[PDB]
Amino acid sequence: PTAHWSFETKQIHAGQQPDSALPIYQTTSNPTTDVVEQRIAALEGGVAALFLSSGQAAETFAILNLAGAGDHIVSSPRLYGGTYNLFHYSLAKLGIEVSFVDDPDNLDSWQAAVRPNTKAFFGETISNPQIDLLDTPGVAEVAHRNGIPLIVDNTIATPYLIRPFTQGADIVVHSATKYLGGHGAAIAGVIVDGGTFDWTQGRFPEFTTPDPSYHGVVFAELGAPAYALKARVQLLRDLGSAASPFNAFLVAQGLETLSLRIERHVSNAQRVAEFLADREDVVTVNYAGLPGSPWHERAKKLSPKGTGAVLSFELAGGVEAGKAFVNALKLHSHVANIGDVRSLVIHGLVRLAVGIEGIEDILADLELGFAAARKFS
Amino acid sequence: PTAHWSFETKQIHAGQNARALPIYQTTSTRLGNPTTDVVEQRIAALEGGVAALFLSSGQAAETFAILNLAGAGDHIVSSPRLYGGTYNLFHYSLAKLGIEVSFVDDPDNLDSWQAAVRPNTKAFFGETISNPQIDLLDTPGVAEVAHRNGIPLIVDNTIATPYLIRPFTQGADIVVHSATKYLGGHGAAIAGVIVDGGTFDWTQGRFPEFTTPDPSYHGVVFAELGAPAYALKARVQLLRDLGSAASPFNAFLVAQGLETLSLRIERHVSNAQRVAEFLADREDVVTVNYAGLPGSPWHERAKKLSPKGTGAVLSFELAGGVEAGKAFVNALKLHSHVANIGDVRSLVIHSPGLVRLAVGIEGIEDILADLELGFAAARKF
Amino acid sequence: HWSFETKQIHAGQNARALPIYQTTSYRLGNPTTDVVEQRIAALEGGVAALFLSSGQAAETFAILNLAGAGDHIVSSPRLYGGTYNLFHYSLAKLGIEVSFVDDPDNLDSWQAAVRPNTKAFFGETISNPQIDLLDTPGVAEVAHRNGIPLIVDNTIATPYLIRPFTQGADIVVHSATKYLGGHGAAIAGVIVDGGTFDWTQGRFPEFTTPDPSYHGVVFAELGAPAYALKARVQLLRDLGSAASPFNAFLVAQGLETLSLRIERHVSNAQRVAEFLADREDVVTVNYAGLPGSPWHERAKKLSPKGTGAVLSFELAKAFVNALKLHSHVANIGDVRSLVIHPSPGLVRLAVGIEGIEDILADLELGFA
Amino acid sequence: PTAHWSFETKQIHAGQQPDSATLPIYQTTSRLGNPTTDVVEQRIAALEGGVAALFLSSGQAAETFAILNLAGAGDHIVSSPRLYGGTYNLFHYSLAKLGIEVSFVDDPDNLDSWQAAVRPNTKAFFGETISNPQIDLLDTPGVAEVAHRNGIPLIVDNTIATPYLIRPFTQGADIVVHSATKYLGGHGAAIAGVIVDGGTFDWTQGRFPEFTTPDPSYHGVVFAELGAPAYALKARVQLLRDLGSAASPFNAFLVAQGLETLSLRIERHVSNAQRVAEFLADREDVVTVNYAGLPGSPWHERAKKLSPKGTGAVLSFELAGGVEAGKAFVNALKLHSHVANIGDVRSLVIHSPGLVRLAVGIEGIEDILADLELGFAAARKFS
């Protein structure tokens, strides 16, 4: 019907009421949330999505939907600190062991980490501060040949740059707090089900055994959105990481301009990267969009429109130069979250999430940081 | 400082040129929020606790209350008189996480609680008033068994509210509410809250997570933080990792409900009492469950633990089983079939002739007139 | 059929909370705001209501729906300061002359102020800081025998205490900012049409002439809610004092406990009034609920359940500075008690729903 | 300090707390102002380069307050006849009842007509920078020059252009009005109006005694003595105080959020609208297209001078088959909304004989064009 719509059309209209041509159902007796779920699914080309209280809860649910006590996960070591803390501390206490591969670019390393109780592979499509790209097709190929699904976090790339289901991923997670909502005004997470994975190959008896908690349903018999439905009826029901309808409303409102924002974030980031790479007082820049990045060729293949809005770089003067540089910035925020419209310092490496301000104001602000770092030759 | 205020004053001012609460609708600590902080402090003040943690839902509050103490290989002892959502959490989702929840046969038998104690038991759990039984938990008695084994007692105080029972004064260590219900009061904001009594010694030996430097959080030893150790641990570990965060807008809405809590519970309770009496006096009603009725086995317990009343939920049995009850609920014109317990709106839900009501704050005579419609309809069966 | 209590939750409404139609799509009605209007109309017993950006806009619309340049209004001098400013300054600029009777208790003064171009009488059912009660039946019969409608502001009394349509008023105005919303969280006004006035008697050709701005409609031929409908399709359309659906939602939330809050505000205020009257260091107390008030007997007739929650008293700057619980900034009609020291020893209170003993404790700190 | 910032920086940062580096909703009635609303006022004023702004309940209220701040009973306004129907209704019906006479010039491009309508009681000139359905541009410098030589201020409504395309204070306007409901908020989610004071007009020349006489309603203040923002301050302390057209803080929050992407949205609205215009102009079954961005428009040269980045997102056109063709065309559209407001991100039909009026959204251009083809297939039965 509307599958052929462009991205731009979808970010406004996908999931809308069939007679629209968005009321906040702030009730505990959800239609507001369902629209935002349908819209995000449509942007990723997934079959269904589940909107939740935060990105942390989305990562939690993505894992817990498959794994419990005595189960195992294989993860890239290149992780957001909040995901690492979840995997390494709180999940370990629930009897889920998360192993990290030595080098996520080494496909043999993923294979070697596979164990009989492994329930998923996990990685981030673009990680920070490295600004690598995951080899989603190659990692997915290893997972699938073992009967294991691949979960990826696509927060930094967004669906505008990468639709990982087209690359082999089975489950996509976003911190909607960040780019999807875009305005720093609503904490939210979302899990998107690709509907690409066969749940009946052996490792997932919870998908093939009648669930006495829910009318004896066998989730795999629900077809493509099995995983998403199971997460809603078991995890959301029991663990209760529900999204406020008001937050759903706000994220839907931010989604209406997603492509426009990402286009500007990305062109600003590319320019900041290039600016930095050309300076004598910068030792190195990490940004896949630069010709010299080790992941630039991969970016041309997997993410041709750009490599997100986050970058990092090292100053010649080391740790003290880095501190002096960041503490001198006036326009860059020190309190904003990645994925806001605002430029910010992410809390000798300096880490920036580049905003949609005027590029000349952004570069003038960075010159303040360079002036401050100058005392630390 | 202001611990001496009345409940009425606290519900408006506790935690606070007094005025309405602004909404910090912002994701820029990310582990606190000025709007939510105030609601936490207020709910803590109303229960007489030392700290509280406000969350996405009541379900998440139950979840966090258990997970803050128990992980894979651990054990919990619960009353079998449980809200369906808590039952499912305990029996399905926690089991998956390696946590065994054992239910006592009869929660009024204190020896049964003792007998269920195991070396890996990490808490006792019960609801101060359960539904549809409308019993009261023997909070003092159950607490005493828990404490003599070095175990804390967690209670859900949702139906009673802090206006009727402050369980910390009866031996509970941790209190959970679905703030979705009575606390917010208007059916407008899904939310949960955990309140820490600060009355339990975490160093007796079952809780090495409280006595061991935490590598995730600067080597802090939670027990050394004193009275609010449990609340702080839950925030810095569980909310941090698991992310059952509340929207600041939902906290604002709950605050707005809190401002009238005691007024609303007073009328919910006076109405519910009258509905119960009304029902107990009818010949086409087989039995009524409600602790405020003299005939209830928990009536005397209510006089000691909850003298102002026994909440606003009740149930009762009709002569004709399922079929009389189906047409009873189908005839009501004022009672909602979709509103949540703890809304201002009366609601109805269908022993096979068992009808369950959460009595609202509508005019009593309108409520009773509406029920007569139900009786008439059921009398075709 | 339904009691006030059931109406404040269900009037206008598988009952559940009101959704928020936060949207500018199609435009001069909104489903969230519609419910709050019907609800408030049900509580006052009117035929229709119109919910607006503020009480000031409600006063403004209530006059401008009837009067334009070259017209006249007769008003009580016992007015809220914002209404006085509107009447005396802004409306004068628009060529509307507002005249104030010397004594609003003097029914013959009302009669004497009538002019050929007079388009309404106005008064407040309970005024502040005097805490009189308007003689609504008596002012209304003076108005009506001259072919003129009575507009009253019922903000302080609320519909829980007085339903002025029962006493001869034709239009009622509230600052829903105050007691209706109840929580200091939503600026709003409302006009309620009693549907009790014949608009065709001669002073109102705007009601008996086809409106070329609106399909030649003759507003009087719409029957009972002619006034409310006219205000919506002309004034709201053109002047644009619209309420946010979010503010309507917040006021609906407050309405759900209105009777409960007013009951408590009024027993607290009644007790605070009585407290204050018993004290040798207090010269006088204004509160119609006190047996000594000149308006006490009128209160028994027109407001038997009590006389609002606002009061004032004269002392023999220090008193307020000592208060720790009373807010200096909360608006009248918030849950929070409010104090003001503007007689040169006059103190003004809006008594909240805090515990009465804490309120009186806080006042005792005042007396020091 | 932050004047040199680009438009893009300002739409995010102008008016922010000075320590925001190291937007709460003050939904409190504790009272002619609010920090949430003040941020949105300062940000809009910065985008226009004005000295102050006043944010209000709706665009209708902003038009109302912009006139009533200057005119009461027995006063006069000169207006362009090219007006939004909501403004015309206000001017012609409600303000007329308040004793305010609004005259319309026959042709707003004839500067001598503006002069000829000036009366001793004239308090303002009014026009829209781009009107709809004509999609002309007001001759803001020439109209301003006439106003000013008579000691009269020029009020313009800059809603359709937005501050991204035109800053009318740079072209002689003194007061700017927006329906913030539309493009400023951008998401069809908050009704609002705003009045922006240019700080560019001398109020002491003779026609404005309300600005040079002590006001007993407000401490004997002489508004002109407050300097540049006299007009905005007077509107706040008199009209907002008395007439009460206040904005909900929640609405201000929502508009502030939409402002964060203003330039980006307007860029895409405008390049979409230019493509739709060219597409229509090239069709045999379209008789004419009104859009200033087209070379054929009588206002295209004026656009090149006054609005070089483009001419808004609204257009109109006439179909060959007249009125039935136009109705068939609009009724067949599936993606265009029939209920959204101008200035939403959504494409919509806005409600000569066969005239179709569109506000072009930021959807994918190919999808917008395919939807219009539904309309052309429907119109085919009316040649």
* C-beta of residue B205 within 8 angstroms of C-beta of residue B177: no
For D255, nearest residue in chain A (alpha carbons): A253
Q: Is B280 helix (H, G, I), strand (E, B) or coil?
A: helix
Three-state secondary-structure class, residue D130: strand
CA A269 – CA A306 distance, rounded (Å): 9
| CA-angle at B211, arms to B206 and B216, nearest 5° | 115
In the block, which residue shows the tokens 């000025």? B34
Instruction: Please tell me the distance in Å from D105's CA to the nearest CA on chain B.
Output: 48
DSSP D32-84: ---HHHHHHHHHHHHHHT-SEEEEES-HHHHHHHHHHTT--TT-EEEE-S---
Mark yes or no for CB contact A26/C16 under 8 Å.
no
Size of interface C-D (CB pairs under 8 A): 171
Domain borders along chain C are 34-259, 260-368
Task: Tell me the Cα Rg of chain D.
Answer: 21
The whole-angstrom separation of Cα B14 and Cα A287 is 50
User: How far apart (Å, rounded) are the C-alpha atoms in residues D144 and B59?
Assistant: 64
Pick the CATH number of B37-262 from 3.90.550.10, 3.40.50.1100, 3.40.640.10, 1.10.10.10: 3.40.640.10
Distance (Å) from the alpha carbon of B161 to chain D's nearest alpha carbon: 28
Among candidates A9, A253, A360 on the partner chain, residue whose Cβ is nearest the Cβ of D363: A9
**Inter-chain touch C235–D181, beta carbons under 8 Å:** no
Length of chain D: 383
Q: How many other C-beta atoms lie within 10 A of the C-beta of residue A148?
A: 23
* Record: contact C52-D248, CB cut-off 8 A: no
Pick C16's closest partner by Cβ from B12, B267, B336.
B336
In this complex, do C17 and A27 lie within 8 Å of one another by their Cβ atoms?
Answer: yes
* A163-180 CB burial, b ≥16 within 10 A, e <16: bbbebbbbbbbbbbbbbb
Work out whether the CA dihedral A334, A340, A341, A346 comes out positive or negative: positive
Q: Determine the Cα–Cα distance for residues B296 and B310; give it in Å rounded to an integer.
A: 11
Chain-chain contact of A94 with B92 (C-beta, under 8 angstroms): no
Beta bridge partners of B214: B220
Q: How far apart are CA B2 and CA A357, in angstroms?
A: 47
CA distance A262 to D194: 29
Residue D197: strand pairing partners: D52, D175
Test A29 with B338 for CB contact under 8 angstroms.
Answer: yes
Residues on chain C touching A29 (C-beta within 8 angstroms): 16-17
Pair of tokens at residue A297: 């060729």
- Distance in Å, alpha carbon of A24 to nearest chain D alpha carbon: 11
Residues forming a β-bridge with D128: D157
Answer whether B26 sits within 8 Å of D27, measured CB to CB: no
Identify the H or E element spanning C338.
Answer: strand C338-340
Q: Which helix (H) or strand (E) segment is C262 a member of?
A: helix C258-277
Q: Which residue of D has its CA nearest to C66?
A: D97
Cβ within 8 Å of residue B300, ≥6 positions away:
none
Buried b (16+ CB within 10 A) or exposed e, D348-372: bbbeeebbbbbbbbbbbbebbeebb
State which amino acid sits at residue A150.
L
D301 three-state secondary structure: helix
Q: Does C327 touch chain D (CB under 8 A)?
A: yes
State the smallest CA–CA distance between residue B91 and chain A in angstroms. Answer: 9
Alpha helices, DSSP H, located in chain A: 7-13, 31-44, 55-64, 81-85, 91-93, 107-113, 136-145, 158-161, 205-208, 226-230, 237-239, 245-255, 258-277, 296-302, 318-328, 359-373
Pairing of β B174-178 and β B153-156: parallel
Q: Which of A23, A29, A249 sits opposite C16 (nearest CB)?
A: A29
Q: Which of B185, B264, B363 sits opposite C3 (nearest CB)?
A: B363
* H or E element, residue C159: helix C158-161
CATH of D38-263, one of 3.40.640.10, 3.30.930.10, 3.60.110.10, 3.40.50.360: 3.40.640.10
Q: Pick one of 2.40.40.20, 3.30.70.141, 3.20.20.80, 3.90.1150.10 as the CATH number of D264-383.
A: 3.90.1150.10
Distance from CA of A297 to the nearest CA of B (A): 34
State whether CATH 3.90.1150.10 applies to domain A260-377: yes
Put simply, the chain D residues between 4 and 33 with a CB less than 8 A from any chain C CB are 27-31
On whether the CB atoms of residues B360 and B303 are closer than 8 A, the answer is no
Burial of A212 (0-12, 13-18, 19+ CB in 10 A): exposed
CB contact under 8 Å between A13 and D257, yes or no, is no
Q: What is the residue whose two structure tokens read 């219900």?
A: B181
User: What is the CATH code of the structural domain delimited by C34-259?
Assistant: 3.40.640.10
D24 vs B25: CB contact, 8 Å cut-off? Answer: yes
Q: Could you give the 3-state DSSP secondary structure of residue A374?
A: helix
Nearest by CB to A360, from D6, D23, D338: name it.
D6
Given a contact as 3+ CB pairs under 8 Å, which chains touch B?
A: A, C, D
CA distance D333 to D348: 9
- Cα nearest neighbour of A30 on chain C: C19
Tokens of A321: 């130069």
Interchain CB contact of B346 with A (< 8 Å)? no
Determine phi and psi for D200, rounding to 5 degrees.
-110, -5
Residue C183: alpha-carbon gap to chain centroid: 17
CB distance A332–D261 less than 8 Å? Answer: no
Nearest to residue D111, comparing CAs of D74, D162, D149, D72?
A: D149
Closest CA to B191 of B39, B359, B25, B358: B39
Contact A113, A73 (CB under 8 A): no
- CATH ID of B263-381, from 3.20.130.10, 3.90.480.20, 3.90.1150.10, 3.40.50.2020: 3.90.1150.10
CATH match of C260-368 with 3.30.70.20: no
Q: Quick one: CA torsion of A91, A92, A97, A103, rounded to 10 degrees?
A: 80
A 10 A CB-CB count for B136 gives: 28
* Interface touch C26/D339, C-beta < 8 Å: yes
**Alpha-carbon Rg for chain B in angstroms:** 21
Residue D193 has phi, psi (to 5 degrees) of: -130, 165
> Given strand A282-286, what is the order of strands in its sheet?
A282-286, A310-315, A349-353, A344-345
Q: By the CB < 8 Å criterion, does C316 face chain B?
A: no
CA separation, residue D248 to residues C48, C54, D55, D99 (Å): 24, 10, 10, 30
Under 8 Å between Cβ of C50 and C173:
no
What is the C-alpha to C-alpha distance for residues C103 and B275, in angstroms, rounded to an integer? 51
Chain C neighbours, 3+ Cβ pairs < 8 A? A, B, D
Residue A98 parent element (H or E): strand A97-100
Interface of C with D in 86-115 (CB under 8 A): 86, 88-90, 93-95
**Residue C1, token pair as written in the block:** 């059929």
Nearest-CA distance A220 → chain B (Å): 19
Give me the count of residues in chain A: 377
Residues 164-183 of D with CB under 8 A from C: 181
Contacts of A240 in chain B (CB under 8 A): 55-63, 192, 244
Interface test with D, best of C20, C183, C187, C335 (most D CBs within 10 A): C187
